[PDB]
Amino acid sequence: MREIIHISTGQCGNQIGAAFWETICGEHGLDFNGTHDDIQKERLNVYFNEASSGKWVPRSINVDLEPGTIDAVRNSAIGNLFRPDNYIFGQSSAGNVWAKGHYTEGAELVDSVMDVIRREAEGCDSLQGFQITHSLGGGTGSGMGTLLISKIREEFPDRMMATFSVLPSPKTRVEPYNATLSVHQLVEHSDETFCIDNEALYDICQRTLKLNQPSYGDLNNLVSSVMSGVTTSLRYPGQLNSDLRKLAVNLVPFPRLHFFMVGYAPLTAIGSLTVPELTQQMFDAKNMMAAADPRNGRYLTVAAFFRGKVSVKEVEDEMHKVQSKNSDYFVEWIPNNVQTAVCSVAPQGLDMAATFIANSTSIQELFKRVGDQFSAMFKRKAFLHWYTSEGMDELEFSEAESNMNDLVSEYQQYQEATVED
Amino acid sequence: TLPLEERLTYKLWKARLEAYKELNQLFRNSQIYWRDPTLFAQYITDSNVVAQEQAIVALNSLIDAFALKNAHNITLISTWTPLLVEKGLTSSRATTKTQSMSCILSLCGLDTSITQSVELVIPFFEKKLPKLIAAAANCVYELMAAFGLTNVNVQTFLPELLKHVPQLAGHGDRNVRSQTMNLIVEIYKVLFKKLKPIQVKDLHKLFAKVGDLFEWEKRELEKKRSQEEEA
Amino acid sequence: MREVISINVGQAGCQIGNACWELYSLEHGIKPDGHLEDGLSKPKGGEEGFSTFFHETGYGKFVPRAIYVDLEPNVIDEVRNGPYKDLFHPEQLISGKEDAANNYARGHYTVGREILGDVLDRIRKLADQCDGLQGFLFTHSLGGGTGSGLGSLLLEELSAEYGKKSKLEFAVYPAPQVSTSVVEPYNTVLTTHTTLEHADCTFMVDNEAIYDMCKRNLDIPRPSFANLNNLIAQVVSSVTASLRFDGSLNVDLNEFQTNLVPYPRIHFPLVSYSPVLSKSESNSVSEITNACFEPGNQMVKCDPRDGKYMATCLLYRGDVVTRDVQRAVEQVKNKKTVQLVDWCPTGFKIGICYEPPTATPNSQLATVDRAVCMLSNTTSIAEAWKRIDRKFDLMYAKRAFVHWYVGEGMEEGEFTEAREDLAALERDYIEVGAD
Ligand SMILES: Nc1nc2c(ncn2[C@@H]2O[C@H](COP(=O)(O)OP(=O)(O)OP(=O)(O)O)[C@@H](O)[C@H]2O)c(=O)[nH]1
Ligand SMILES: Nc1nc2c(ncn2[C@@H]2O[C@H](COP(=O)(O)OP(=O)(O)OP(=O)(O)O)[C@@H](O)[C@H]2O)c(=O)[nH]1
Ligand SMILES: [Mg+2]
Ligand SMILES: [Mg+2]
């Protein structure tokens, strides 16, 4: 039944994961302690583990290197249906330094959470992999999360490693360090990494949703709405991308090029839609969640997901048309870049919605700006003491910088015409 | 604060780090950790890579001082080598990887042949972690290209080694296969039919590309080198 | 009796086989129980053909000589829990726990290798229950990882232990309209290379042709896989009707290689079928014959009035009278429709099976009193390979998605060999049209 194990890491990771679980509960038709259309019940054992009671508890693990935010979800509404022994937390945080979470205090907690997932896997017919919600900006989410990834693959070498990475933005002064280090790790160990830019996320809430001074919560509603729509193919039968491996093959042409952008539609929260309108609003840069120019660049592969009261034929005719008009944005040497999936289940309360997973080469601008910030500090050898006092090295920094730089070089490289070898 | 014996295993990782580096300098500028291997067999797996990196660095320094008794050596190899291959060659750190291998090679010099060492590395072929399998293959590779089949009964040795080779040659992971083939060309430099036809073709190509010390072998070379001073 | 074992690999293979075994059960009066329909006393086939595909495992109990294979348990579980759960023996439905995930590599080298022993055992169990095993009928897509990877692997091991037995193949050629994978061109080129010398005659089913046929003739704006499979079964049943009933042509698996293939490598005939009416009048022999030479009636999307014809077998079913066919066939020869090859001494071969064709009551197809099926080995089918080779060439020029294969036990050079072999195959189809 191909089960999936979710791991939340850090404040952002545990808060985002929380919104994800709170969302897909209703879609599957569950109470906030785990209890119609019957499609909601089919792939229910993918994200939820059947407790001998007819009641479901999420196959989730909530790790943070400090009780702070993990305490918060603990006594919130969905704090119920979470397995009490899936909560892992240390005494003191990691003060926003990647080194502590990855070498010192984070590594000491890793073994304790491994027991949980090792016990969890001992309850799966045939587990397919893991998904990780974390933030590259901090010290626990980036540092411990990546260390968790590397050791999870050492124990489960043939399982899928999906990841929902949250990218920091210029608005603490060491976020580029932590993000560049985690990226250096993700490019070597992550099978799938959905990149979500906090700047784009913020701009949607402020410009589109006209929320004056938005909160992390509002930011998470968009992350959650995307994650739900993304995993639609994973929680409902008779689809296209049913596995985490099938989805990866269709989306990842080259091993170290597995970082994707996400888009969601509709968004506008006034205070019905038509398939062609929805499709236009899906490819709209105003409806994207990454501060890079998607029109300037090329899509390597695309995977859209339509949900709700929408006919398959009218969705397929609309995607095929959109691909014709914008055939210059889709790479020529990958015939059929786009996989379009339709689901009858509605996100509620919405008649229909569309989720957008793109492997665009324009994402280089995300790694570009961060690499430009990493450099400006690394040249001055700034803030190093806080990292190098945890057992880190200046060489490891230069590796992360030069590595992620090559990552960019590859994206720009593949924006070339039909050339042999 | 002091003493060294407790700091070596004290709760804080940093203390263990500095203490290992102290053991290291103690070895270089020459404290008998040669008697009981359990000591360094604990340090080789320090559970803190930054400190573990230096325990292995110091381990390599420890064996570099000795320079007798083939029975005690077999125990050192049976205790350390499997640990260095499992937790040192599978590591993703440059210093750890290089130093770990050097220990495995230098520990093999204490013996008369690669037999005992190789037979300790072999059972890793049945692990499910690919980079661990490839590490073992690359390890057995290095063992040969450093000492050769010198002082080995190739009648008993090879058919055991090749016994678990085909299964690895068709392994899913690319790197394992790449190292397996690299092990084949070495065995030649001193089986097919169960191998993919295309693998054999590429092998035959790689074959057409050839031009052309244990502890005791060093003691004997110097035994005559010293006695050569009969002026 | 000379038995034939029908092996189905992958999702497409098992779902097509569902339709085929639903129609074969309906043609011979077999209920989902494996029992005879009320009043029969004897199966509508036997004594003549029915014994070949069905095995009377006991009085009144008739079980299809079939083996389903799939690396995921999903598709096959539907059979185990469906209305035909009693038709097959549980030992005939084999499944793994994880699939090949659109990857030919793990289907052939990694995963599919792990379930091989089981399948080779069950086949042997079936082959031992035969008193004169004639051969096999492979049905699988070339797009997915299992039907392509494990399917080709299975066709290789069958040539290994059942060498003297002939094998016929039904391959589901990939189509962009109903594709499930971007790397379908890779999978396709890889298997065709590894099944090019392990198949005596391969019938190609282009999903694009079946799609547009369901769209045009059947008037369905978006045909599902069930729609496609209903049509496909109707054709496959017609292809193997002479085996299961009174046949005057192709009454033997070996007769296919004899009647259709001049050389081993060329064994991909173009299949035509007529008529295909919606379930909402009556036609004739002249019409269905003419329709066989029109572009919108082939299993592969190419022109019947193109290329060179090396062999042709016209197979009629139902209320058909010889005078009409001799007349209708003569109308085709005299009007010089197709262009026969100069070196072939004989031409059109005709077969008649008076057992009327039938469509399932739960299908979108109507029942016709008389229908025809044309199996023609034309050089116009080379265009199908030509098409898939561009798709392949485009990606491979940048080694796109290749790492997925080398990561699953395949050498990068195997792509090269599989490409040259298909390149040679393309040349073979143009050079065989000369003289
Ligand atoms: N979208 C979103 N981002 C968040 C949220 N909380 C924190 N972040 C981001 O995470 C980065 C810092 O890491 P955190 O997740 O807050 O904390 P951590 O990962 O546990 O690391 P430590 O605080 O050192 O333990 C900041 O740059 C924030 O932008 C959240 O609730 N939603
Ligand atoms: N005619 C027909 N083709 C089908 C059907 N289902 C899938 N296909 C074709 O099969 C191709 C994909 O391969 P799969 O059907 O998934 O075969 P598979 O063995 O399950 O492949 P994996 O599950 O990835 O290992 C697609 O191009 C479809 O066109 C069907 O019901 N009828
Ligand atoms: Mg925190
Ligand atoms: Mg399948």
Helix percent of chain A reads 40-55%
Question: What share of the residues of chain B lie within helices?
Answer: 55-70%
Q: Give the CA-based shape of chain B.
A: globular
Give the strand content of chain A: 15-25%
Structural class assignment of chain A: alpha/beta
Kindly, what is the distance between the CA atoms of the first and last residues of chain A, rounded to a whole number of angstroms? 42 Å
Q: Assess the beta-strand content of chain B as a share of residues.
A: under 5%
CATH topology of the largest domain in chain A: Rossmann fold
Bound molecules: guanosine-5'-triphosphate, magnesium ion
Strand count, sense and closure of the main sheet of chain A? 10 strands, mixed
Overall number of structural domains of chain B: 1
Report the count of strand segments of chain A.
12
Q: CATH topology of chain B, anyone?
A: Leucine-rich Repeat Variant
Specify the overall morphology of chain A. globular
Please report the number of helical segments of chain B. 13
| CATH architecture call of chain B | Alpha Horseshoe
Regarding quaternary structure, how should these chains be classified? Answer: heterotrimer
- What is the CATH superfamily label of the largest domain in chain A? Tubulin/FtsZ, GTPase domain
Order of helices and strands of chain B: HHHHHHHHHHHHH
Outline the structure in words.
The complex is a heterotrimer of chains A (421), B (231) and C (435). By secondary structure, chain A is α/β, with parallel strands linked by helices. Chain A has helices at residues 10-28, 39-42, 67-74, 98-102, 107-121, 140-155, 175-189, 198-208, 216-230, 232-235, 244-251, 275-283, 312-325, 364-378, 384-388, 394-413; strands at 4-9, 48-51, 55-58, 60-64, 87-89, 129-135, 160-167, 192-197, 259-265, 299-308, 338-343, 352-360. Chain A has 16 helices and twelve strands. In chain A, helix 7 (175-189) crosses helix 16 (394-413). Chain A starts with a strand and ends in an 8-residue tail after the last helix. Helices cover 66% and strands 0% of the residues of chain B. The longest helix of chain B has 18 residues, at 70-87. The radius of gyration of chain B is 20 Å and the shape is globular. Chain C folds into three domains: 1-269, Rossmann fold (3-Layer(aba) Sandwich); 270-380, 60s Ribosomal Protein L30, Chain: A (2-Layer Sandwich); 381-435, Helix Hairpins (Orthogonal Bundle), CATH 1.10.287. In chain C, the strands form three sheets. In chain C, strands 5-4-1-6-7-8 form a six-stranded parallel β-sheet, with helices on both faces. In chain C, strands 9-12-10-11 form a four-stranded mixed β-sheet, sandwiched between helices. In chain C, helix 1 packs across helix 9, helix 7 crosses helix 14 (382-396) and helix 12 runs parallel beside helix 13. Chains in contact: A-B, A-C, B-C. The A-C interface holds A 2, 125-126, 128, 240, 243, 245-246, 249-250, 252-255, 301, 311-313, 316, 332-337, 339, 414, 418-421 and C 97-99, 101-103, 176, 179-183, 185, 221-222, 391, 394-395, 397-401, 403-404. The structure holds guanosine-5'-triphosphate (2 copies) and magnesium ion (2 copies).
